[PDB]
RNA sequence: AGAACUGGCGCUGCGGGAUGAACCGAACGCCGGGUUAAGGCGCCCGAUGCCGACGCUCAUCAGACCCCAGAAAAGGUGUU
RNA sequence: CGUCGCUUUUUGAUCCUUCGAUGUCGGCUCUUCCUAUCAUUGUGAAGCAGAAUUCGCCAAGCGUUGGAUUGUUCACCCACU
RNA sequence: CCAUCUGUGGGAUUAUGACUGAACGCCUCUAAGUCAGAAUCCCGCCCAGGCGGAACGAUACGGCAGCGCCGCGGAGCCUCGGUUGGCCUCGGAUAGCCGGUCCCCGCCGGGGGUCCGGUGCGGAGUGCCCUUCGUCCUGGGAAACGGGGCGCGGCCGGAAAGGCGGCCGCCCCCUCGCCCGUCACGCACCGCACGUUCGUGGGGAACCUGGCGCUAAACCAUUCGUAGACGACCUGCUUC
């Protein structure tokens, strides 16, 4: 009774089930909520983390003793091929929380989106959304599908917008797009609405939706370690070389009469590849990636305004476990939750 | 068939302990807007014990044990399950009987709507004396669809007025149409036995 | 053509608190909540009528899955407009809250 | 006990005219009109008599906490009644030692942006209650100057400032300094 | 609000009780609760009732501060309260309550038949009120 | 810890005291109808679903029924 | 000088449970709880000028260490806080 | 922490200090009514997602088979329960309800004077069906819309869980869809139970039986390594 010596929890309650995500994509817990005020903008994006490099800038912060000097800080890439919308939907608010109108999409949607629809491509048919491509062509389909959009505007408080990415445009062996559902946080639903349906399968840039120094919020899944035990899992101090059946193990599991084995305590079990979202990553550029062909090829990424060199900000050897950076990109100071090769969504 | 009972203005424990007699008889009852039941006692004094149920929590893990639930329709509907025999399959077929909805959903909202004078805090409270909201008091305590509701509710009621309004526009058509009579041979039956 | 009989549910069997006594039933008889106003219905004939899967009836042309356990209604049961009823089976319990049928049979008036 | 009832009276003058719908009371007069609901107080009120005036509230049997509200409604009605026709007007004063406090007026005599109290950086926006007028007096050192209609609404406004200038970590005894309500008195004068 | 009284004088029609459905006059006032009354012509004497039990009439007699029974007998008749009562739409409720009890099974027959013969031409007739009205709008 | 007188438990179920060796009723062959004792009668849970009577009391730790399972001195322009 | 309580973290008194066995000091390790609050938040009072302290209030959210001696709990000392 | 990055605001309020203000003709933070108020409390952020619910996609050919949708009769198998429905103002309670001339809100709603009622009778102690045995003969009163529909064609209202409803035009059709009366009949089964409904219910298995349409996908195996004790999880697999 009372240990003598206070120490602190050892590791947090706020992150119990520590358990593998039931999901590989990252998903949106809460969007930002939207004054109507407002222009009409996207808020969330897709990205895919290649790797690390750093950075020197000439730092400004009065007060300090850094200010007007270089330093050095860890940034990582985000590779970011544009978004392509495909599908609208409505979200109607119940005493029982929110719950889903109806969803639209779009007239031909593309090749990589229809196979997320599939566990196995390869034995299908491809027969998906082949009588619903139909009803935007045929004229009894149509009238009411411009009426869905109608019951859509009168009913519903909230849309979101279904986007996908261009998986061909990057060195990764999937071809399967990852199928997000993010949410037009601008004005009056009518304006919130004639925006998506104005841009039904066409792309979306990165900075149309995000902007350098534009501090934003990653949500991923953390890089994977498997079952690990209790001094990897929660870091508890190993026990004296003395110890018979065992070092690495949390010795006191609990008392006597709660006679039950506590929530709070730590034991082994799986360790990472946990849903994250980080919070307060501040972007440092929005890089876009190898134009037109008649300048043969502009590399010119990581080209600083005291640099002047014909560089590119995939380093000498590729990135490693990666590929090679094609498209538009976003840096972010400091680590990013993730392994590399993972779909991450950005997040204002 | 089922009884609809519309909840404000009624006490929690009164009604509920009604409510809990008439589900084990076989009927099916229906307790609508359970946002407005009153509770007798200030609002501070109702708020600490609800929150001296927040801990109740069993120690091992609170996954497993005491589920606290924060919409008035639940508490209601918890209030109702202690007082029927809930670890018998007599009292597990009982609460099926019982169906409880916060707000007035559409299947109910068209429907009259009945009061229990027995659980009125007119009726039953002392003028003097003060109570507290379930609605409000769940608020403080986690429920995050009060807006929401209200929002609901004064909808539903202005479409509930232009009803009202059109049926007392039929019944003084068909009292003004009882005036020109042409049948006062069939009046006098009822006015001598009870019209 | 229309109901020959008022509506009654079956509340429960004659009681203590712990031990119960399964001969007696009582009955929660529909509009009267008084025991001034019980005595229309006493010596009445009362009826739990239910439903099997083989077939009987006495002289209906052809036996159906309808079948019946008989009674009477023996005194009041209390202030409140009950009453208990003294059948020839005891009823099973699965009828608790399930209504009977009480006729008008034995009558005074 | 649960006495016989009691019964005061308010008479009313002629430039005011009391209406109720109930137990709300609609007092309209000379410089605008405010209404106070009383739906919480369980008494009858009745206005008897054209060309006279008077409010009569009484309360049915009661007990000696019941019967301690009925003075309380028609000392509130006095209030409604001086307010629409003379109004409420708290001077009030600030009291300092070493630092003056400088008190300005931002949003049309609604909120009040006090600095300099005591030596202190940071800034103190008070903003007031709807229906009172801030003021910077004048022939008179610091003085600040609140008028309304509404007496409940005046001085909550006046205590909000007082409130607000409040010494912290001293003692108090000494360091006497703060802006502290003056006088009490009326936007007409001698009615 | 609070248009009737007790006061000596005042009449009280009797819910419940042993002595339902009779009018009492309100003699004296005891205390807070019990009240002294008496009808003599209406065959229910003197004796104290509670309040809770009698019903506030808005008839009132001018007799003495709880005289005998004669000087309530002459201020009850004369001012002829048994007929007043009986042209008031409060007796008349009371009145067709009970014809309406002891309505036996054959009335209940003759209620029936006519009650459904005056809904036909009402209905039919305030079907021609909604067919003119229509008619006033569409021009 | 140890006596006196009587009743109990041990050897004894049952109704009530939520629960129980000893408390309160009452002692037991197997049943049907009637009535009660102690105890109760919002709903668990049979019975006040009486148009019960009269008051006292508001608690930001109310109170709530023998044994029995929680409190004293002191104090209150809190109400009676 | 009195006098009324509370608590079961001390020591006793007791001998109801356990003798066909409940593993018996301390340290280590780790968890949770209590308030009779050391610090921190908001306050009230001083024989409160400031600074430093003391006495109370809502308060257990969050902290409450590093060592020399001793098997020690306890004790004592150094140093930080 | 032996390198680097990030750590998030709202509410009701405690203590307390007050406002107005009686009791107690003053006074008073309290008694009714108010204000400010915090490492506490509760939520948000964050972590998991219920024997908890959605929206949507595709829905089995081949060589015969096979499956949905509507319109159908024909039987048996099981689970049993109910015996007519009320199709809705908000609410106040020391107060409310109805009808109403006038001046304000794109021909409807807000106010006040006035007339009503009120132990609520423009009263779920109520109301409309109805306690409808049917038919024929046969006269009155009431009624000139017909009422059920497999109808066909239309519109537009109800998203909180709409799966419901209303109006309209053509139509095989009724002109007996009511009350009183005249007339004579049908299982009059010989005193007797479970009768009489919702109901041509709910679930399943099959067949003779009309049209409308439909021709997929999971898991293994293989591969991958953003994943792994094993399952799970993330991927690829086109004749380019
Ligand atoms: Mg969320
Ligand atoms: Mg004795």
Same mark, same amino acid.
């Given at each position: 009774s009372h240990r003598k010596f206070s120490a602190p929890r050892h590791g947090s309650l706020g992150f119990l089930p520590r358990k593998r995500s039931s999901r590989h994509r990252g998903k949106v817990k809460s969007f930002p909520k939207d004054d109507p005020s407002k222009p009409v903008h996207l808020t969330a994006f897709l990205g895919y983390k290649a790797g690390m490099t750093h950075i020197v800038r000439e730092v400004d912060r009065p007060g300090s003793k850094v200010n007007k000097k270089e330093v050095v800080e860890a940034v990582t890439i985000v590779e970011t091929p544009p978004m392509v919308v495909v599908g609208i939907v409505g979200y109607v608010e119940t005493p029982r929380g929110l719950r889903t109108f109806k969803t639209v999409f779009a007239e031909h949607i593309s090749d990589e989106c229809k196979r997320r629809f599939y566990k196995n491509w390869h034995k299908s048919k491809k027969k998906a959304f082949t009588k619903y491509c139909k009803k935007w062509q045929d004229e009894d389909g149509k009238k009411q599908l411009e009426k869905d959009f109608s019951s859509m505007?009168?009913?519903?408080?909230?849309?979101?917008?279904?986007?996908?990415?261009?998986?061909?445009?990057?060195?990764?062996?999937?071809?399967?797009?990852?199928?997000? !559902?993010?949410?037009?946080?601008?004005?009056?639903?009518? !304006?919130?609405?004639?925006?998506?349906?104005?841009?039904?399968?066409?792309?979306?840039?990165?900075?149309?939706?995000?902007?350098?120094? !534009?501090?934003?919020?990653?949500?991923?899944?953390?890089?994977?370690?498997?079952?690990?035990?209790?001094?990897?899992?929660?870091?508890?101090?190993?026990?004296?070389?003395?110890?018979?059946?065992?070092?690495?193990?949390?010795?006191?599991?609990?008392?006597?009469?709660?006679?039950?084995?506590?929530?709070?305590?730590?034991?082994?079990?799986?360790?990472?590849?946990?849903?994250?979202?980080?919070?307060?990553?501040?972007?440092?550029?929005?890089?876009?990636?190898?134009?037109?062909?008649?300048?043969?090829?502009?590399?010119?990424?990581?080209?600083?305004?005291?640099?002047?060199?014909?560089?590119?900000?995939?380093?000498?050897?590729?990135?490693?476990?990666?590929?090679?950076?094609?498209?538009?990109?976003?840096?972010?100071?400091?680590?990013?939750?993730?392994?590399?090769?993972?779909?991450?969504?950005?997040?204002? | 068939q089922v009884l609809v009972l519309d909840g404000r203005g009624h006490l929690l424990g009164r009604l509920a302990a009604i409510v809990a007699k008439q589900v084990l008889l076989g009927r099916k009852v229906v307790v609508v807007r359970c946002e407005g039941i009153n509770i007798s006692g200030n609002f501070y004094r109702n708020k600490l014990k609800y929150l001296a149920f927040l801990r109740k929590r069993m120690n091992t893990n609170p996954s497993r044990g005491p589920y606290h639930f924060r919409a008035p329709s639940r508490i209601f509907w918890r209030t109702v399950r202690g007082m029927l025999p809930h670890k018998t399959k007599r009292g597990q077929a009982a609460l099926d009987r019982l169906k409880v909805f916060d707000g007035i959903p559409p299947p109910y909202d068209k429907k009259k709507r009945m009061v229990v004078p027995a659980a009125l805090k007119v009726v039953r409270l002392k003028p003097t004396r003060k109570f507290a909201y379930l609605g409000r008091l769940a608020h403080e305590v986690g429920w995050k669809y009060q807006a929401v509701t209200a929002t609901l509710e004064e909808k539903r009621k202005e479409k509930a007025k232009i009803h009202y309004r059109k049926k007392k526009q039929l019944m003084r058509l068909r009292k003004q149409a009882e005036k020109n009579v042409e049948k006062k041979i069939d009046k006098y039956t009822e006015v001598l036995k009870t019209h | 053509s229309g109901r020959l009989w008022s509506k009654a549910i079956f509340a429960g069997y004659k009681r203590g608190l712990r031990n119960q006594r399964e001969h007696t039933a009582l009955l929660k008889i529909e509009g009267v909540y008084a025991r001034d106003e019980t005595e229309f219905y006493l010596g009445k004939r009362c009826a739990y009528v239910y439903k099997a899967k083989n077939n009987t009836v006495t002289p209906g042309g052809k036996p159906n899955k309808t079948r019946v356990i008989w009674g009477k209604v023996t005194r009041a049961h209390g202030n409140s407009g009950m009453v208990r009823a003294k059948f020839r089976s005891n009823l099973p319990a699965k009828a608790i809250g399930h209504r009977i049928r009480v006729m008008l049979y034995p009558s005074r008036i | 006990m649960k006495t016989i009832l009691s019964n005061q009276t308010v008479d009313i003058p002629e430039n005011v005219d009391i209406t109720l719908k109930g137990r709300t009371v609609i007092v309209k007069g000379p410089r605008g009109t405010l209404r106070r609901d009383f739906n919480h107080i369980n008494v009858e009120l009745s206005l008897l008599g054209k060309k006279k005036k008077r409010l009569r509230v009484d309360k049915w049997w009661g007990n000696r906490k019941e019967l301690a509200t009925v003075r309380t409604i028609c000392s509130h009605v006095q209030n409604m009644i001086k307010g629409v026709t003379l109004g409420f007007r708290y001077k009030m004063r600030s009291v300092?030692?070493?630092?003056?406090?400088?008190?300005?007026?931002?949003?049309?005599?609604?909120?009040?942006?006090?600095?300099?109290?005591?030596?202190?950086?940071?800034?103190?926006?008070?903003?007031?209650?709807?229906?009172?007028?801030?003021?910077?007096?004048?022939?008179?050192?610091?003085?600040?100057?609140?008028?309304?209609?509404?007496?409940?609404?005046?001085?909550?406004?006046?205590?909000?400032?007082?409130?607000?200038?409040?010494?912290?970590?001293?003692?108090?005894?000494?360091?006497?300094?703060?802006?502290?309500?003056?006088?009490?008195?009326?936007?007409?004068?001698?009615? | 609000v609070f248009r009737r009284f007790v006061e000596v004088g005042r009449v009280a029609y009797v819910s419940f009780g042993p002595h339902a459905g009779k009018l009492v006059a309100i003699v004296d006032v005891i205390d807070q609760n019990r009240a002294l009354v008496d009808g003599p012509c209406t065959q229910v004497r003197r004796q104290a009732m509670p309040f809770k039990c009698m019903q506030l009439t808005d008839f009132i007699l001018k007799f003495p501060h709880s005289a005998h029974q004669k000087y309530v007998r002459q201020a009850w008749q004369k001012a002829d309260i048994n007929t007043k009562w009986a042209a008031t739409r409060w007796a008349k409720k009371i009145e067709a309550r009970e014809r309406k009890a002891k309505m036996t099974d054959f009335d209940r027959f003759k209620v029936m038949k006519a009650k459904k013969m005056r809904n036909r031409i009402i209905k039919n007739e305030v079907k021609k009120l909604q067919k003119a009205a229509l008619l006033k709008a569409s021009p």
């Open positions: 505007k009168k009913y519903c408080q909230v849309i979101r917008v279904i986007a996908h990415t261009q998986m061909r445009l990057l060195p990764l062996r999937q071809k399967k797009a990852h199928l997000m !559902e993010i949410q037009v946080n601008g004005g009056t639903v009518a !304006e919130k609405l004639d925006w998506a349906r104005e841009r039904l399968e066409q792309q979306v840039p990165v900075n149309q939706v995000f902007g350098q120094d !534009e501090m934003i919020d990653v949500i991923g899944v953390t890089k994977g370690k498997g079952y690990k035990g209790v001094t990897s899992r929660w870091h508890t101090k190993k026990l004296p070389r003395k110890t018979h059946r065992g070092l690495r193990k949390v010795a006191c599991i609990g008392a006597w009469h709660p006679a039950r084995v506590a929530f709070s305590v730590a034991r082994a079990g799986q360790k990472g590849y946990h849903h994250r979202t980080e919070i307060n990553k501040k972007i440092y550029k929005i890089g876009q990636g190898y134009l037109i062909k008649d300048g043969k090829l502009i590399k010119n990424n990581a080209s600083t305004d005291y640099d002047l060199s014909d560089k590119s900000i995939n380093p000498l050897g590729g990135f490693v476990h990666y590929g090679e950076v094609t498209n538009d990109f976003v840096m972010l100071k400091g680590c990013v939750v993730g392994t590399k090769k993972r779909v991450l969504t950005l997040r204002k | - | - | 300092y030692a070493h630092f003056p406090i400088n008190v300005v007026i931002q949003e049309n005599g609604s909120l009040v942006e006090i600095r300099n109290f005591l030596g202190e950086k940071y800034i103190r926006r008070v903003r007031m209650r709807p229906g009172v007028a801030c003021s910077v007096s004048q022939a008179q050192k610091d003085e600040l100057i609140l008028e309304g209609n509404d007496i409940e609404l005046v001085s909550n406004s006046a205590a909000l400032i007082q409130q607000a200038t409040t010494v912290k970590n001293k003692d108090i005894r000494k360091f006497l300094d703060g802006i502290y309500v003056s006088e009490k008195g009326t936007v007409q004068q001698a009615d | -």
